[PDB]
From a paper:
The phosphorylation of proteins on Ser and Thr residues is mediated by protein Ser/Thr kinases, whereas protein Ser/Thr phosphatases (PSTPs) hydrolyze protein-bound phosphomonoesters. One of these interfaces, which occurs in about 90 % of all validated PIPs, is referred to as the RVxF-type PP1-binding motif (single-letter amino acid code, x=any amino acid), which binds to a site on PP1 that is remote from the active site. In our work we sought to develop a proteolytically stable, cell-permeable peptide that specifically disrupts PP1–PIP interactions and modulates PP1 signaling in living cells. In conclusion, we have developed a cell-permeable peptide (PDP3) that competes with endogenous RVxF-containing PIPs for binding to PP1 in living cells, but does not bind the closely related phosphatase PP2A.
We then applied an iterative design strategy involving the sequential addition of arginine/lysine residues to the N-terminus, thereby enhancing its cell penetration without significantly compromising its efficacy as a PP1–PIP-disrupting peptide. This led to the design of PDP2, which also disrupted the PP1:I2 complex but was slightly less efficient than the nonpermeable peptide PDP1. The corresponding RATA mutant of PDP2 (PDP2m), showed no effect in the deinhibition assays, confirming the importance of valine and phenylalanine in mediating the high-affinity binding of PDP2 to PP1. To understand in detail how PDP2 interacts with PP1, we solved the crystal structure of the PP1:PDP2 complex at a resoluion of 3.1 Å. The structure shows that PDP2 binds in the same groove of PP1 as other structurally characterized PIPs containing the RVxF motif. As in previous structures, Val14 and Phe16 are buried in the binding groove and Arg13 interacts with PP1 Asp242. The C-terminal isoleucine makes van der Waals contacts with PP1 Leu296, suggesting why alanine mutation of this residue resulted in a decreased potency. Hydrophobic contacts with PP1 Leu296 are also observed in the PP1:spinophilin complex. Mutation of the basic N-terminal residues of PDP2 led to a decreased potency, but these residues are not observed in the crystal structure. However, the position of the visible N-terminal residues of PDP2 suggests that these basic residues are located adjacent to a negatively charged region on the surface of PP1. The efficient cross-linking of PDP3 to PP1 can be explained from the PP1:PDP2 crystal structure, where Met290 of PP1 is in close proximity to Ala18 which, when replaced by Bpa, presumably results in the formation of a covalent bond between Bpa and the Met290 side chain.
Residue numbers in the entry:
A (entry chain A): 9 to 300
B (entry chain C): 11 to 23
């Protein structure tokens, strides 16, 4: 129904913090429907330009509306999201709902990837399960899990821009490896899938190194360079990490990092960004600053 | 046919 998406957009213009309390049936519907569409589409998305790409939102619902305000609400534009929708922020429930709605309404112009914070392992503890349990019930959180497990892992835009939440993997040799993993699936402790959602680029590291997070790896400019060449690609688009200005380059503009949730947590005191990728595969960046 | 390019200037929203 358009009723749920209407009610979600209704709090636009309101002072930041006002909730939107859907019925659990609506939300359940949103999960089950979008779940079916996720398994309808490939786990490795073959996408086309033009599209706008966003990074971590982490429940900051009113900042998401600002991004849509500028970028045009679907289907004014096409959208890829690089995961990490829930936790840390005040309104995870609204955020994931609005997105799934759009995914259901425009399944061919709106796309969602799995971020590391789309696991029962990490929704618990970091704030999402708490929100479900406070505003709804445990059973509803289990539903969300079962929906998150069907999320796409990576995407490729016009056979040139590789998009995923975390980054590269030492176990990644061919793309057909990404197409092999059957959904639904939980993110494992270690391996290809986990690396894709957890790994980081590192300036000081040479090759494959340890990660301060405690899971997966750090990688260096050499791996980025040789990966693009080996796969007929020009750029790696990823999120996962907090960077001021919203975006930050790695290697010689061979990997960009996108973070779309301003003043994350906070404090951190950062900014958010999104990539405008046009039909000529030209990328431009638009910055969001922390609101008054 | 098409290759990746970056607009040098960014803009504030
Ligand atoms: Mn992350």
């Amino acid at each position: 129904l358009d009723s749920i998406i209407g009610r979600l957009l209704e709090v636009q213009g309101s002072r930041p913090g006002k909730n939107v309390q859907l019925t659990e049936n609506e939300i359940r519907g949103l999960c089950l429907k979008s779940r079916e569409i996720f398994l309808s589409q490939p786990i490795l998305l073959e996408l086309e330009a033009p599209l706008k790409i966003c990074g971590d939102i982490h429940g900051q619902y009113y900042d998401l509306l600002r991004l849509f305000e500028y970028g045009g609400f679907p289907p004014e534009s096409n959208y890829l999201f690089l995961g990490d929708y829930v936790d840390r922020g005040k309104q995870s429930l609204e955020t994931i709902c609005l997105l799934l709605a759009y995914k259901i309404k425009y399944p061919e112009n709106f796309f969602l990837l799995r971020g590391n914070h789309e696991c029962a392992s990490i929704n618990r503890i970091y704030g999402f399960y708490d929100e479900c349990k406070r505003r709804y019930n445990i059973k509803l959180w289990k539903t969300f899990t079962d929906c998150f497990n069907c999320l796409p892992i990576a995407a490729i835009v016009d056979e040139k821009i590789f998009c995923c939440h975390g980054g590269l993997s030492p176990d990644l040799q061919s793309m057909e490896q990404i197409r092999r993993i059957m959904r639904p699936t939980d993110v494992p402790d270690q391996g290809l899938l986990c690396d894709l959602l957890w790994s980081d680029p590192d300036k000081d590291v040479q090759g494959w190194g340890e990660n301060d997070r405690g899971v997966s790896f750090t990688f260096g400019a050499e791996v980025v360079a040789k990966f693009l060449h080996k796969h007929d690609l020009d750029l790696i688009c990823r999120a996962h990490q907090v960077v001021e200005d919203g975006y930050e380059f790695f290697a010689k503009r061979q990997l960009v990092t996108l973070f779309s949730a301003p003043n994350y947590c906070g404090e951190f005191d950062n900014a958010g960004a999104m990539m405008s990728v046009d039909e000529t595969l030209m990328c431009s960046f638009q910055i969001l600053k922390p609101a008054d | 046919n098409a290759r990746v390019t970056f607009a040098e200037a960014a803009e504030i929203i």
